[PDB]
Amino acid sequence: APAAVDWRARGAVTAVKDQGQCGSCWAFSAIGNVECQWFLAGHPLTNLSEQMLVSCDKTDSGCSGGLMNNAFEWIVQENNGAVYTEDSYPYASGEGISPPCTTSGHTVGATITGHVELPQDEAQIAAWLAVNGPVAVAVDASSWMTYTGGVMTSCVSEQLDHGVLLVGYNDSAAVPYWIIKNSWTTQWGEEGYIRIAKGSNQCLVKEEASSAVVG
Numbered sequence: 001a002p003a004a005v006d007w008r009a010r011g012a013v014t015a016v017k018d019q020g021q022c023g024s025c026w027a028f029s030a031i032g033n034v035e036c037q038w039f040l041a042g043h044p045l046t047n048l049s050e051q052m053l054v055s056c057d058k059t060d061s062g063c064s065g066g067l068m069n070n071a072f073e074w075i076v077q078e079n080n081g082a083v084y085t086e087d088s089y090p091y092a093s094g095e096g097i098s099p100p101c102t103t104s105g106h107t108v109g110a111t112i113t114g115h116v117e118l119p120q121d122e123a124q125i126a127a128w129l130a131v132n133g134p135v136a137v138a139v140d141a142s143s144w145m146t147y148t149g150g151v152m153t154s155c156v157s158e159q160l161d162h163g164v165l166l167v168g169y170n171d172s173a174a175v176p177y178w179i180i181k182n183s184w185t186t187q188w189g190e191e192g193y194i195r196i197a198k199g200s201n202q203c204l205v206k207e208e209a210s211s212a213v214v215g
């Protein structure tokens with residue numbers, strides 16, 4: 001692996017978004033992973049639709065929660081790989097309640113064929129990300145509300161509750177670290193990002209890492 005990677009510097013990551021009062025983190029994680037994957041497949045960076053998942057993926061639970069894996073599964077086994085563009089299925093759940101789902105004629109902004117699952121090993125996740133781009137991951141984020149910047153070294157790491165996107169790491173530093181995209185607007189953290197220490201499984205970050213596959 002290289003000493004440091006940051007996919008934002010390669011234009012592979014969209015603007016920081018805002019889930020509102022909806023527990024749809026899982027959606028924003030999964031969709032952000034696909035957005036990056038599509039670009040790295042050689043297509044242009046495009047905002048894809050979390051509202052599609054929140055409203056139409058029935059195996060997950062909309063604003064009451066879900067899982068990135070399920071979402072990749074539902075997209076491929078139930079939605080023929082189609083991830084609609086945001087422009088075409090805009091986000092409407094920011095108030096907290098999620099609208100019903102109805103679908104003549106949306107614009108497919110991306111086609112995935114599957115997903116992969118990464119080992120529960122930070123070095124292995126990093127080697128994959130170094131080659132193939134941002135990784136969907138789960139974390140314990142109970143210590144996060146109070147975050148305003150810096151590298152987290154004492155993350156409460158007891159129980160997973162939130163999905164985010166790993167977009168880089170830096171093993172060069174005195175304290176190595178992951179770079180993670182959150183979905184709580186750019187008001188929160190380091191313009192909407194958080195760095196957490198790398199190598200101590202901070203926030204259980206390695207426990208549930210996965211990625212969509214553009215095939």
Ligand SMILES: *[C@H](CC(=O)N1C(=O)C=C(OC)[C@@H]1C)[C@H](C)NC(=O)[C@H](CC(C)C)NC(=O)[C@H](CC(C)C)OC(=O)[C@H]([C@@H](C)CC)N(C)C
Binds near residue numbers: 064162
């Ligand atoms: C998004 C998380 C979130 O929105 N927020 C926080 O974590 C803190 C916040 O403060 C502002 C905001 C509100 C939602 C609520 N979390 C989830 O959807 C998680 C994401 C995964 C951990 C990747 N999923 C679940 O909680 C999931 C719910 C079912 C799939 C319907 O529950 C589990 O993953 C549990 C397990 C962790 C408990 C042992 N599993 C047994 C289903």
Ligand SMILES: [K+]
């Ligand atoms: K080098």
Ligand SMILES: [K+]
Binds near residue numbers: 117118119120
């Ligand atoms: K695994």
Ligand SMILES: [K+]
Binds near residue numbers: 157202
């Ligand atoms: K720890």
Ligand SMILES: [K+]
Binds near residue numbers: 118207210
């Ligand atoms: K995994």
